[PDB]
Amino acid sequence: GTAELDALWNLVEAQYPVQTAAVTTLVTVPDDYKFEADPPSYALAGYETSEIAGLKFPKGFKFGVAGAAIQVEGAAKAEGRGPSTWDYLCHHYASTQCNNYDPDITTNHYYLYPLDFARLQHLGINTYSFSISWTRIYPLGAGYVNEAGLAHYDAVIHSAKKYGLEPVGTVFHWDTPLSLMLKYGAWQDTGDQIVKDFVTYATTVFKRYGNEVKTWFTFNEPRVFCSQNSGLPYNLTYPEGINSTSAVFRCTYNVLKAHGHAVKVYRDLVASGTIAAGEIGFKSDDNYPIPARPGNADDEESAKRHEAFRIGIFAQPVYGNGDYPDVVKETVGDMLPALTDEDKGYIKGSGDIFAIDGYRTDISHAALNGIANCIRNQSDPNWPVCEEGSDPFAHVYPSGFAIGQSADPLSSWLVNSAPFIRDQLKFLTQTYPAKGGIYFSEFGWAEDAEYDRQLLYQITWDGLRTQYLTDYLSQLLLAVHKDGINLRGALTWSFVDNWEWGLGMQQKFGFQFVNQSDPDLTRTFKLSAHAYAQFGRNHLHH
Numbered sequence: 001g002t003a004e005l006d007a008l009w010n011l012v013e014a015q016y017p018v019q020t021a022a023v024t025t026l027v028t029v030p031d032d033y034k035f036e037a038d039p040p041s042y043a044l045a046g047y048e049t050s051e052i053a054g055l056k057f058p059k060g061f062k063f064g065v066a067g068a069a070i071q072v073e074g075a076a077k078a079e080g081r082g083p084s085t086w087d088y089l090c091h092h093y094a095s096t097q098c099n100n101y102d103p104d105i106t107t108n109h110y111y112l113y114p115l116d117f118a119r120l121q122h123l124g125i126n127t128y129s130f131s132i133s134w135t136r137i138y139p140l141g142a143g144y145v146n147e148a149g150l151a152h153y154d155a156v157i158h159s160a161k162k163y164g165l166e167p168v169g170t171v172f173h174w175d176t177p178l179s180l181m182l183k184y185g186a187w188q189d190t191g192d193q194i195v196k197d198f199v200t201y202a203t204t205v206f207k208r209y210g211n212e213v214k215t216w217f218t219f220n221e222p223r224v225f226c227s228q229n230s231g232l233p234y235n236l237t238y239p240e241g242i243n244s245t246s247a248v249f250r251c252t253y254n255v256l257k258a259h260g261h262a263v264k265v266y267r268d269l270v271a272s273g274t275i276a277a278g279e280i281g282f283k284s285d286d287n288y289p290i291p292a293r294p295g296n297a298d299d300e301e302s303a304k305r306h307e308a309f310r311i312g313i314f315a316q317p318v319y320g321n322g323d324y325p326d327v328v329k330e331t332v333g334d335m336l337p338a339l340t341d342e343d344k345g346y347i348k349g350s351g352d353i354f355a356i357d358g359y360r361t362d363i364s365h366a367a368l369n370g371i372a373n374c375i376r377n378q379s380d381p382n383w384p385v386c387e388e389g390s391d392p393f394a395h396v397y398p399s400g401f402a403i404g405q406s407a408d409p410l411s412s413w414l415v416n417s418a419p420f421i422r423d424q425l426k427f428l429t430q431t432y433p434a435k436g437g438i439y440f441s442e443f444g445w446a447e448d449a450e451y452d453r454q455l456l457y458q459i460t461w462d463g464l465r466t467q468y469l470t471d472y473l474s475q476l477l478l479a480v481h482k483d484g485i486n487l488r489g490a491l492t493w494s495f496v497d498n499w500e501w502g503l504g505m506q507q508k509f510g511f512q513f514v515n516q517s518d519p520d521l522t523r524t525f526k527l528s529a530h531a532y533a534q535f536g537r538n539h540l541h542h
């Protein structure tokens, strides 16, 4: 075995070791598997608006679910895997950064996936979005490849297709290799080793899986990911010249570069016949907020600044003019490395598809102390967007009423803003056009205080999640037929209650309940799973 790997896990486990699940064997699905009974017929009867009666998504529409490796897999040390920055974080600062959880086991999907896939087939799901753990493939981020890790996802993809699930792959979903962070600061790299290391990793998984995975995302929510680089454990290892503010924009640049170069490799692999042709982009998130006071020039300005910093900083280089938005360049200056002409040749046009994690739409109130004042004060709490960023503004009209229903208060960024979906899709497809169209690549609900229920029947009738998914799907269906949006699919986050980063298993996003007090981590369908299934039955082509 490799010695540097052992040293890294010794480091990670210095205060407490990785916990091992009760099941560490690939489960097999018996042909006599009995699914729990359906909910009462009145639970969803006549539940959809009449406005969508008889409307169908286009043929081939990806009607599916989304997960991510470190959030659902567990098996943190199984079969050669090296540690990620989150393994380190939670094993060292669990009580302050991870809500006293860690991703050691989560839902144990690493071993339970055939059972998960059989349950998804029962619901008529036709698409399975997953991410690949970089450190299962290159346990040190770079150097030797872990064949056991490559073979694992071979079996996952094969099992998915056997159960009717088209696999959609994300190369990087926030699980930075700890080794690369320690060696040179990972995404804060002031050189370009992080790009070389990411591209080598991406090349390996494209070669191994590109004949069976034909829809790829390089990065999941790169704007959200790079803002995490301002905290632990990344700010233990900043290179000289980097602080927690400039770390975010050095990360932005390195990710844009890594994305462009990986897309270049992917296209080379397709053009050489090495792998089947597919489509590649990255997953955007956030939104173009509505101004708090329509027609007010300040709210309108802060709304666009929000869009520029939360979407445009990655989407304009890839799908637009090939450079950062001007309002970004003017505010952050030289903390953001400039895109050279050579850089732009890789990045511009490197997205066949757009994908939006369209959870919600916000409201933009211009900074009460003036946008012009805010912009110039890097220490202003609303810098650099210079809208009022706190919850009592971001979700609230001047009237004092919210834009919509709030979800669990620990995920206060999340609200049901279904009436605004069609406007977001129109803005995104006109501003960041992609030949392959647009995916609604994540959307989901954290039902308020669902973690405090003690009785299963109280959990499984999850009315506000059911409403949210049905509302959103209905608006997506209307975006296709009324607005002509080239919508390629809808993927809900998520199919199981899983490990939600710093909140751990407390926050429940699944349309299935995962019983974390049971050695088998038994899954149970919630009502929302059946609402999702029924919407697929009523509105997909068969």
Ligand SMILES: *[C@@H]1O[C@H](CO)[C@@H](O[C@@H]2O[C@H](CO)[C@@H](O)[C@H](O)[C@H]2NC(C)=O)[C@H](O)[C@H]1NC(C)=O
Residues within 6 Å of the ligand: 097, 230, 231, 232, 235, 244
């Ligand atoms: C590094 O990141 C951590 C977050 O993981 C930052 O923690 C903040 O620390 C300040 C100082 O005590 C507290 O006011 C904040 O509440 C902390 N935030 C969190 C989320 O714990 C830390 O500031 C960063 N260190 C820097 C910038 O040097």
Ligand SMILES: *[C@@H]1O[C@H](CO)[C@@H](O[C@@H]2O[C@H](CO)[C@@H](O)[C@H](O)[C@H]2NC(C)=O)[C@H](O)[C@H]1NC(C)=O
Residues within 6 Å of the ligand: 241, 242, 243, 244, 245, 246, 332, 333, 334, 335, 378
């Ligand atoms: C982190 O680094 C940035 C620069 O990389 C610092 O911003 C500089 O701040 C000085 C002092 O006002 C200015 O002269 C420069 O104009 C700033 N650079 C910019 C904004 O482009 C930033 O202050 C550092 N942050 C902290 C808190 O250490």
Ligand SMILES: *[C@@H]1O[C@H](CO)[C@@H](O[C@@H]2O[C@H](CO)[C@@H](O)[C@H](O)[C@H]2NC(C)=O)[C@H](O)[C@H]1NC(C)=O
Residues within 6 Å of the ligand: 373, 377, 378, 379, 380, 381
């Ligand atoms: C830049 O923003 C910082 C943070 O808001 C401002 O610092 C505050 O100054 C106000 C003045 O009344 C005090 O009430 C706060 O105690 C200060 N807080 C901190 C953390 O410094 C600073 O005034 C702003 N500078 C400007 C407007 O140029």
Ligand SMILES: *[C@@H]1O[C@H](CO)[C@@H](O)[C@H](O)[C@H]1NC(C)=O
Residues within 6 Å of the ligand: 454, 455, 456, 515, 516, 517, 518, 519
């Ligand atoms: C979860 O499973 C445990 C152990 O079997 C059982 O104690 C508990 O009732 C279950 N909780 C549910 C279904 O909410």
Ligand SMILES: *[C@H]1O[C@H](CO)[C@@H](O)[C@H](O)[C@@H]1O
Residues within 6 Å of the ligand: 017, 018, 019, 020, 021, 077
């Ligand atoms: C859980 O426990 C096993 C021992 O059975 C270890 O191999 C693993 O690393 C984890 O500590």
Ligand SMILES: *[C@H]1O[C@H](CO)[C@@H](O)[C@H](O)[C@@H]1O
Residues within 6 Å of the ligand: 020, 023, 024, 025
């Ligand atoms: C999964 O791995 C664990 C590690 O301790 C074993 O105990 C178990 O028998 C299975 O092989």
